[PDB]
Amino acid sequence: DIQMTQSPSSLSASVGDRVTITCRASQSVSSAVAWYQQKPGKAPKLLIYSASSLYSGVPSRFSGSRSGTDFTLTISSLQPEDFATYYCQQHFWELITFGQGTKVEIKRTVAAPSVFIFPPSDSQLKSGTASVVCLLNNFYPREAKVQWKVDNALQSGNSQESVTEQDSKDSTYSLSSTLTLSKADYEKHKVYACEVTHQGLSSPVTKSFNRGEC
Amino acid sequence: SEVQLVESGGGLVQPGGSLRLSCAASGFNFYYYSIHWVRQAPGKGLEWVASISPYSGYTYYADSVKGRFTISADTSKNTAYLQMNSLRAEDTAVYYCARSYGWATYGLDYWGQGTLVTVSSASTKGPSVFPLAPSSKSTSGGTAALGCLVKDYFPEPVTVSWNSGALTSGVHTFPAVLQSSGLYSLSSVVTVPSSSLGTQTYICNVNHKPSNTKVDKKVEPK
Amino acid sequence: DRFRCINVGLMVQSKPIEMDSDMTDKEKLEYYRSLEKDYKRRIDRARPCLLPAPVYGEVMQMLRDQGKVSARLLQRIRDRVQKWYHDEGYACAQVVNFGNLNTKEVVCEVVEGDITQLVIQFQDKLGNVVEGNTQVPVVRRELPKQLRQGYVFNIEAGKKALSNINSLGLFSNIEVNPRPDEKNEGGIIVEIKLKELE
């Protein structure tokens, strides 16, 4: 099937840079490619309608360009109002196909997270469920690896992480990682830890507790 | 001059159910334009789902939806419609209605506001708020973190405030994650000075308007 | 409720078109129709392609046996058209766009592989590419007219060159190769690599 490959998945850029996002059609079948900008919580807006034509009321910093099966969106001097997700789209008659997207984020200094462990609440063991919480606060960049160690063993399937939007003031990321278990499994095993790997950590740190001892 | 689209309909449905969405075309003559329906999954990319041809009534559907969705349009009231049947969980998405002039050669210029279609074997449910114990052994000096765990609820949204809005600096209300139950779970943390732990006691004000639940819980060390 | 014609145009040329603000849709039908008119103008300005009538007919029968025009059918049409082009030794030919004048008229745009420049690269006995215009005047003759700039490249003309110059006994290895011309969109460079005897 026709498939657009949009790259990069995300790039980080500073206000004033010229940013280029490319996406590639899997076959030379259509020049009817469009570029859209979408800011979170809103509806995508049209930037480029033909493969290179500037749409009405769009600022002049946006440009489109084609080379074979390669389509390129280009911003001259990044303004603050251009941080969003960008999507390329093609019209192979009925087949309307979108690229996977590109998230344009704010460039900032590397900053390791602060890591906090959390035992299940004392109320929660009186409901049958247990929730161990690992918090990674104020870090950059986004790439982070939380590893759950129950008695020096990995845990998969029972860990869910959520990640915040970039901080509106300091431009950082915060992440939570919940490890949900049952009361019996929590009562049997002893040492619960969450090990964090990040760029700004020279070595992976690990926050650990022992259940019941303060 | 720029009069636009409103998607109507949409809501909660169960697996196997059905729904019909409307799309009201105000200010444009949708004979020269083509009406397309595009869906965006929760926190995911864009996916084209259906399209109607300008002038003529040619109907095109995505293979993920073929055989369960039918697009239509009423020329009188300037309206388009999308019928969804044999609904599955993977159809959970926001559904946009957008026009493109001509056929299959120009851009989707004017989009709609959107509409959410949740497909769950659901139960409107208030949450259970649990405390996040602050750390006696202050791990990262200077500051300690405490928060709440809104564990089991449906549907969205919940609002978590801190000390009735007084504590705002340092609060991170994380996006909700749906578990293998059909119920969401979020946490809301905040970093405060390690000194102010014993003097100041912090409380969460969780609020779940769809279920009219209003839990307020104090978080203190054990 | 069908598709009446398949036009097949060959495209190199250049395009302009500009843009404006004050998007009163009432009006902006202006721009979205000026583009249609310009596309018709382009389709008449354009050069017709090398597709013969039988293959036009076969593509149109594929289009009729399926009332509705699907992108998979367009893919099959592309496969057939490129099959014809390559079968006649038009190695560089390729489809690049499937435009529309209305939902009933399909416009297939091809790049046939016109020749923009002729390049002759000489190599010394050991294969080290060298310079030298002492053999160029004689190798320019014994080259078919059809290899000069202004024609669509065909591998048969390449074979005719590869045999005409071969008959002189002046090179131990002769190759005729088309290459994508980086300075021209869709143009082709015919390079002729000659490797000398000893």
**Extents of the domains making up chain C:** 5-111, 115-195
Query: Distance (Å, rounded) from C-alpha C108 to C-alpha C43?
Result: 10
Query: Distance (Å, rounded) from C-alpha B148 to C-alpha B125?
Result: 18
- CB < 8 Å to C68, chain B: 58
Which DSSP symbol is given to B134?
P
What was the experiment behind these coordinates?
X-ray
Query: Distance (Å, rounded) from C-alpha A140 to C-alpha A172?
Result: 5
Candidate from A28, A53, A93 with C-beta closest to C71: A93
Q: Are A43 and A60 in contact (CB under 8 A)?
A: no
- CB < 8 Å to C25, chain B: 1-3, 27-29
Taking the Cβ of residue C36 and every Cβ of chain B, the question of whether any pair is shorter than 8 Å is answered with: yes
Taking the Cβ of residue A53 and every Cβ of chain C, the question of whether any pair is shorter than 8 Å is answered with: yes
User: Strand C188-195 and strand C115-123: pairing?
Assistant: parallel
Residue of B nearest to C99 (CA): B105
Taking the Cβ of residue B114 and every Cβ of chain A, the question of whether any pair is shorter than 8 Å is answered with: yes
CATH 3.30.420.40 fits B128-219, yes or no: no
Tokens representing B159 are: 């609002």
Residues making up chain B, counted from first to last? 222
Query: Distance (Å, rounded) from C-alpha A123 to C-alpha B131?
Result: 8
Taking the Cβ of residue B109 and every Cβ of chain A, the question of whether any pair is shorter than 8 Å is answered with: yes
How is B56-94 classified by DSSP, letter by letter? Answer: S--EEE-TTTTTTEEEEEETTTTEEEEEE-S--GGG-EE
Query: Distance (Å, rounded) from C-alpha B109 to C-alpha B30?
Result: 13
**HEC secondary structure over B138-194:** CCCCCEEEEEEEEEEEECCCCEEEEHHHCCCCCEEECCCEECCCCCEEEEEEEEEEC
Query: Distance (Å, rounded) from C-alpha C100 to C-alpha B214?
Result: 58
State whether residue A129 is helix, strand or coil. Answer: strand
Residue of A nearest to C16 (CA): A53
Q: Are C158 and C176 in contact (CB under 8 A)?
A: yes
Q: How far is CA A213 from CA A149, A205, B92, B136, C105, in A?
A: 18, 22, 44, 12, 78
Distance from CA of B46 to the nearest CA of C (A): 20
Taking CB atoms and an 8 Å limit, are A30 and C21 in contact across chains? Answer: no
Distance from CA of B77 to the nearest CA of A (A): 24
- CB < 8 Å to A162, chain B: 174-177, 186-187
The residues that bridge with A38 in the sheet, in sequence order, are A85
Q: Are C51 and C81 in contact (CB under 8 A)?
A: yes
Domain ranges of chain B: 5-119, 128-219
Distance from CA of C59 to the nearest CA of A (A): 16
Tokens representing A83 are: 């941080």
- CB < 8 Å to A96, chain B: 36, 38, 48, 51
Which DSSP symbol is given to B28?
S
Query: Distance (Å, rounded) from C-alpha C195 to C-alpha C126?
Result: 8
**HEC secondary structure over A172-207:** CEEEEEEEEEEHHHHHHCCEEEEEEEECCCCCCEEE
Residues making up chain A, counted from first to last? 214
Taking CB atoms and an 8 Å limit, are A135 and B179 in contact across chains? Answer: no
> In which residue are the tokens 């790259």 written?
A7
- Can you say whether the dihedral through the CA atoms of A113, A116, A117, A120 is positive or negative? negative
* Cβ-proximal residues to C192 (8 Å cutoff; 6+ apart), any chain: C118, C119, C120, C121, C139, C161, C165, C174, C175, C176, C177
E runs forming strands in C20-170:
47-48, 94-102, 105-111, 115-123, 129-130
Phi-psi region at A3: left, alpha or beta (left = phi > 0; alpha = psi -120 to 50): beta
Q: How many CB atoms lie within 10 A of CB C45?
A: 10
Cis previous bond, B54, omega within 30? no
The residues that bridge with C30 in the sheet, in sequence order, are none
Query: Distance (Å, rounded) from C-alpha C53 to C-alpha B23?
Result: 46
Q: Are B194 and A175 in contact (CB under 8 A)?
A: no
Alpha-carbon dihedral B25, B26, B28, B32, rounded to 10 degrees: 10
Q: Are B39 and B55 in contact (CB under 8 A)?
A: no
Query: Distance (Å, rounded) from C-alpha B145 to C-alpha B139?
Result: 10
Closest CA to A85 of A51, A127, A35, A122: A35
Taking CB atoms and an 8 Å limit, are B2 and C68 in contact across chains? Answer: no
Catalogue all structural domains in chain A, each as residue range(s) with its CATH number. Answer: 4-106 (2.60.40.10), 114-210 (2.60.40.10)
Q: How many CB atoms lie within 10 A of CB A192?
A: 25
Query: Distance (Å, rounded) from C-alpha C131 to C-alpha C121?
Result: 8
The residues that bridge with A70 in the sheet, in sequence order, are A24, A67
Q: Are B124 and B118 in contact (CB under 8 A)?
A: no
Closest CA to A40 of A90, A131, A104, A98: A104
How is A42-72 classified by DSSP, letter by letter? Answer: S--EEEESSSSPBPTT--TTEEEEEETTEEE
End-to-end CA distance of chain A: 58
- CB < 8 Å to B56, chain C: 1, 103
Query: Distance (Å, rounded) from C-alpha A168 to C-alpha A56?
Result: 30
* Rg of chain B, C-alpha, whole Å: 23
Which DSSP symbol is given to C140?
H
Q: Are A35 and A45 in contact (CB under 8 A)?
A: no
> In which residue are the tokens 């490890």 written?
A179
The residues that bridge with C40 in the sheet, in sequence order, are none
Q: At the top level of CATH, which class does the domain B5-119 belong to? A: mainly beta
**For the sheet containing B159-162, what is the strand order?**
B159-162, B202-207, B216-219
Q: At the top level of CATH, which class does the domain C115-195 belong to? A: alpha beta
